[PDB]
Amino acid sequence: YVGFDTITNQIEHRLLKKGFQFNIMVVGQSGLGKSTLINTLFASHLIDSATGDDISALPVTKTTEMKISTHTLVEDRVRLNINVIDTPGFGDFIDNSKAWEPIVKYIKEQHSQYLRKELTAQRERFITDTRVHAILYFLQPNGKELSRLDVEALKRLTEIANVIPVIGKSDTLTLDERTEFRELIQNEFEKYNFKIYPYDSEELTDEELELNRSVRSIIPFAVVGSENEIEINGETFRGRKTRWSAINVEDINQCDFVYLREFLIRTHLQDLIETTSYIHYEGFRARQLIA
């Protein structure tokens, strides 16, 4: 016994003291449960609604603005530095013809900032990575085909970042309306030929591609979010309770929140971060260098 199988222990111990960066962006019109979903995924109140109940809180410039907050969460020994990027003003104005332009600018600006450091003669050992690793795109649960705004926004965002479509407030739909709407949006994705996360790589195994197939079949996720715990017949769980309904957020037989959490965080979290590097950042860097 030599002992070089210990090398994975040496690496994990080196990365644990380092920490981990995750930069996630939520895109959608106000009132789609975006801040609630972020606060439900990470089981902590990280952000407020970018506008709240105050319409005067909308960006005065009448365009989309970036609202970046920074956070840190610990589980056992893994520290996760989280950047949350909300987009107050997207689709909330009378004129939304430039609703995506500040978003595309922010995404490219982070790559530009990173590449500016990779080219210095005296590079730092640990470059601060503020590149957008994931985009949760919130679609309204209205059973309609993609609006012009969604087509324009997605046709650009899906080319520069890992875009994860999500049906916001999906409890609007019955299970049959959920099947018909999800099948309609998937046909919209084929019609416009968008690159929707996850991607299939040649490095993936037959079981990894199969996992990608099964998760891909329920995208966009039908999510229901809640930071508040409710009680039903003594059992306490987090969800929503009304005059006629009681939704268990962590019930896979009711919504796809649990599937989204396993996907975004437990199986494809590192894949999301690295794909931002070797796909999106490298694609950006290649275009800058040739010009």
């Binding site: 506008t51 609007t172 005059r243």
Partner: protein, 249 residues
């Protein structure tokens, strides 16, 4: 026995389902008579209050679904309202008036998305341009997704916005519960007691249209059909139409 109803809301908000639910008849859209919003006019015969009801439902296609939803986009809505005023004014001035086809719009249901936050600038801009020509009735569409508290907080925010924009809602001579939190379903479902009811069935529960504990649907039904349909037509005739005609001269 004529009645003309206007439905302004984004596509997929539930306008058609609420029309079938209110009048309890699926043939509301069986008869379509013939960047800008399209106007769709439907004429149906309804057996409401024993007599035949000559219902005319005016609908919108593509409201709020352009990149730029300025007044030029939704102006066909106002052009149609003023046109129905114009047609009545000319036919009213003729020597032989006796069976005028009164196409004047008697009520305008504005559908608010259940965001739970506030009214958008487009919501305020349109309603600021309609309340002086139609009896404006704002509703919160698909309100089943809102908790009991969200509905109260949302209504409080919406009313303060309409008040600050000097927007005037229809006041029954009911008014305090505006905007109405409504649900829509002319379909039969089975509840947890095995009973046939109208509404929508979910894994998380069954909401019932004709249940006063689940929505404000009956309040809107009383305001529109069963209680205050006559005063809705009266305010259009005696006030809204007269103010339009006066400023036209």
């Amino acid at each position: 026995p004529s009645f003309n109803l206007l439905c302004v809301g984004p596509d997929g908000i539930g306008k058609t389902t609420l029309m079938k639910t209110l009048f309890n008849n699926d043939d509301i859209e069986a008869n379509l008579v013939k960047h800008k919003v399209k106007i769709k006019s439907y004429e149906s015969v309804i057996e409401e209050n024993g007599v035949k009801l000559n219902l005319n439902v005016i609908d919108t296609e593509g409201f709020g679904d352009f990149l730029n939803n300025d007044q030029k986009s939704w102006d066909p809505i106002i052009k149609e309202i003023d046109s129905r005023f114009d047609q009545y004014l000319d036919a009213e001035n003729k020597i032989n008036r006796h069976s005028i086809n009164d196409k004047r719009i008697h009520a305008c249901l504005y559908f608010i998305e259940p965001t739970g936050h506030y009214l958008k600038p487009l919501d305020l801009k349109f309603m600021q341009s309609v309340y002086e020509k139609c009896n404006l009735i704002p509703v919160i569409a698909k309100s089943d997704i809102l908790t009991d508290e969200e509905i109260l907080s949302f209504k409080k925010t919406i009313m303060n916005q309409l008040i600050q924009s000097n927007i005037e809602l229809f006041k029954p001579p009911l008014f305090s519960s505006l905007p109405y939190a409504v649900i829509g379903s002319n379909d039969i479902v089975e509840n947890y007691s095995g009973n046939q009811v109208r509404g929508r069935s979910y894994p998380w529960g069954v909401i019932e249209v004709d249940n006063d504990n689940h929505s404000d649907f009956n309040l809107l039904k009383n305001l529109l059909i069963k209680q205050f349909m006559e005063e809705l037509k009266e305010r259009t005739s005696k006030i809204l139409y007269e103010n339009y005609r006066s400023s036209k001269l």
